[PDB]
Amino acid sequence: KKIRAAIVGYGNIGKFTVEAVEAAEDFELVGIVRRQGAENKPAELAPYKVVQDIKELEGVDVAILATPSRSCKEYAEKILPLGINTVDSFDIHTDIVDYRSALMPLCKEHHAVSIISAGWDPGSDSVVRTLMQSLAPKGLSYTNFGPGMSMGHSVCARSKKGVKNALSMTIPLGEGIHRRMVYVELEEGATLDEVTKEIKADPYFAHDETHVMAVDSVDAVKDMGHGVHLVRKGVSGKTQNQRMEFSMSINNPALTAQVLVNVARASMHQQPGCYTMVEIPVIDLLAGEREDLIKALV
Amino acid sequence: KKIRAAIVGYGNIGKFTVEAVEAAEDFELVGIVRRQGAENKPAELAPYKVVQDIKELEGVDVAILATPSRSCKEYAEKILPLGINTVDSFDIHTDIVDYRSALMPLCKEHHAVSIISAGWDPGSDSVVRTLMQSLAPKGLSYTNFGPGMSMGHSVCARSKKGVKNALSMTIPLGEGIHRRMVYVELEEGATLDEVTKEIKADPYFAHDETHVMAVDSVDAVKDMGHGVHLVRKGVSGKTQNQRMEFSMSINNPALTAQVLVNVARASMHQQPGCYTMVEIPVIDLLAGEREDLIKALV
Ligand SMILES: NC(=O)C1=CN([C@@H]2O[C@H](COP(=O)(O)OP(=O)(O)OC[C@H]3O[C@@H](n4cnc5c(N)ncnc54)[C@H](OP(=O)(O)O)[C@@H]3O)[C@@H](O)[C@H]2O)C=CC1
Ligand SMILES: NC(=O)C1=CN([C@@H]2O[C@H](COP(=O)(O)OP(=O)(O)OC[C@H]3O[C@@H](n4cnc5c(N)ncnc54)[C@H](OP(=O)(O)O)[C@@H]3O)[C@@H](O)[C@H]2O)C=CC1
Secondary structure, rough: OEEEEEEEEOOOOHHHHHHHHHHHEEEEEEEOOOOOOOOOOHHHOOOOOOOOOOOHOOOEEEEOOOOOOOHHHHHHHHHHOOOOEEEEEEHHHHHHHHHHHHHHHHHHHOOEEEEEEOOOOEHHHHHHHHHHHHOOEEEEEEEEEEOOOOOOHHHHOOOOOOOEEEEEEEEEEEOOOEEEEEEEEEEOOOHHHHHHHHHOHHHHOOEEEEEEEEOOOOOOOOEEEEEEEEEEEEEEEEEEEEEEEEEEEEEEHHHHHHHHHHHHHHOOOOOOEEHHHHOOOHHHOOOOOOHHHHHHHH | OEEEEEEEOOOOHHHHHHHHHOOOOEEEEEEOOOOOOOOOOHHHOOOOOOEEEHOOOOOOEEEEEEEEEEHHHHHHHOOOOOOEEEEEEEEEEEHHHHHHHHHHHHHOOOEEEEEOOOOOEEEEEHHHHHHHHHOOOOOEEEEEEEEEEOHHHHHHHHHOOOEEEEEEEEEOOOOOOOEEEEEEOOOOOOOOOOHHHHHHHHHHHHEEEEEEEEOOOOOOOOOOOEEEEEEEEEEEEOOEEEEEEEEEEEEEHHHHHHHHHOOOOOOOHOEEEEEOOOHOOOHHOOOOOOHHHHHHHH
């Protein structure tokens, strides 16, 4: 009747994934899996079992991996043999094919389902981008992120010398082109130019319009808001100039969470194997009877 | 290697469906099926066999039904026993559940696939609307058509007394609310008021802001341009005020055609049965190896 979900990692996503599972009337939250188990359990996790190994939790249908991207395959390969299903928001566009081909046979062998790269991008947007391609298979598509924070670029800026803290904003200038607004807390000694030169040198910044500013508090300029403008102009049949846009103004980690819950729900209805969200019927993402949902949405 | 498609009906969709099949390098056009066979074969159908019964055409994988909506079930029930697959743009939102559960067993018994209600709305938009619902399952969605021509309302206006010709434009006023701009050729004798009162009385117009104008030529004001603004404001997990928009500026029948070709291609990869487009992985709509497509779009 209800789906028994365990969350692996209580990072930013984890926090919102609890909120998203708490809100799904068709879900039970078995427990959260942390490196540090129950220790210093935060207030909002009061009413849930927290452990160090998923093996400690009982009758788990699906593991939502709120892990880093580097950590996803390792934890998946670990959690599948147990017969448990694994959704994740793995976000390294370039590796997605190999990570898929990896879990593929392991999923089948253990009669269980892995859905991978299931956030809003990749995930949600990957579906829209694919539908859009189909609507006019000749022409050009453009993915336009922000304004929003970039966990990757934010990190790749902290990493540089003179940089105590740093947040990199990602600003869309259209046609897949972007602007980087980096805000920094200077370590005692170093100057804005040293740091600026040091950032712009890195491949993550060297090919994009970058502006580096110094601020008292990075935390005082942070906000989990984010967006996207997906755009296609192209040809349906041989009829030119067909135009379509998809846009979001969303809370990034809040939405990534909700999609993970959705592909968790969706894994309970697939032939054992590994799946990107473009391989999943979008109706499986929702709660309810196919007939009732078709009546409402088609 | 290639998919052998027959088109049933050389109406406006039919015309564009040829153009769309001509453009799919993974398709072969076996023939067009008309009531009136080859008889006044139009120039652009020169190089294709045209017949009166699909039985005349040979080694057909999939029948694209470019028929009216009233006619779809009849032609499907006819073409399935022959072992052939049936895609259609059946567009009566209310009947879609019954039409599905009708073909369902018939498709299975004959180990073959029917995809139904596969235009841009329903079809394309049915997918986006469903994904959007998933992204924030609490709140409100709004489908906003036009500006574009309305075949249904256009017809329901010709039907009224004093109306020689009539075209009904559909104008979005947001939040699912619409305006009807009806343009009429008066049958010599009748007056604009009589006709106006006579239209607005009808359920198709009585609940919508309607403006009725009299014009010299209806054909002089026609255009197959059209669009939609799909809109959801709602809640991801328990995070409020998540916003997302999907919009098109397209040639209506041109796009309906291209989607039909897409669900024709998609039917070649499904367990026998009846499917709405929300039941089909969006990747199946495209030509190519899953790996190549995932590399590009996810
Ligand atoms: N598709 C999309 O658009 C989005 C996808 N993402 C995905 O989410 C990931 C992280 O999201 P977020 O929650 O904000 O990140 P955080 O860094 O805040 O959280 C990661 C958590 O994973 C757990 N963890 C498990 N194993 C390890 C390990 N070996 N090293 C470090 N931490 C580990 C930790 O929690 P604990 O110690 O309690 O176990 C940690 O808090 C990204 O790497 C990306 O894959 C990110 C944003 C949106
Ligand atoms: N999803 C969406 O928004 C859209 C949906 N549609 C769908 O497409 C349908 C038809 O559009 P379109 O092709 O422009 O319409 P037309 O009226 O221009 O074409 C209908 C064709 O159906 C064939 N036909 C076969 N049997 C019959 C019959 N008994 N009575 C009438 N026609 C018959 C005919 O082909 P021939 O004359 O050569 O024999 C005829 O030309 C709509 O009713 C709707 O279901 C339309 C466009 C957009």
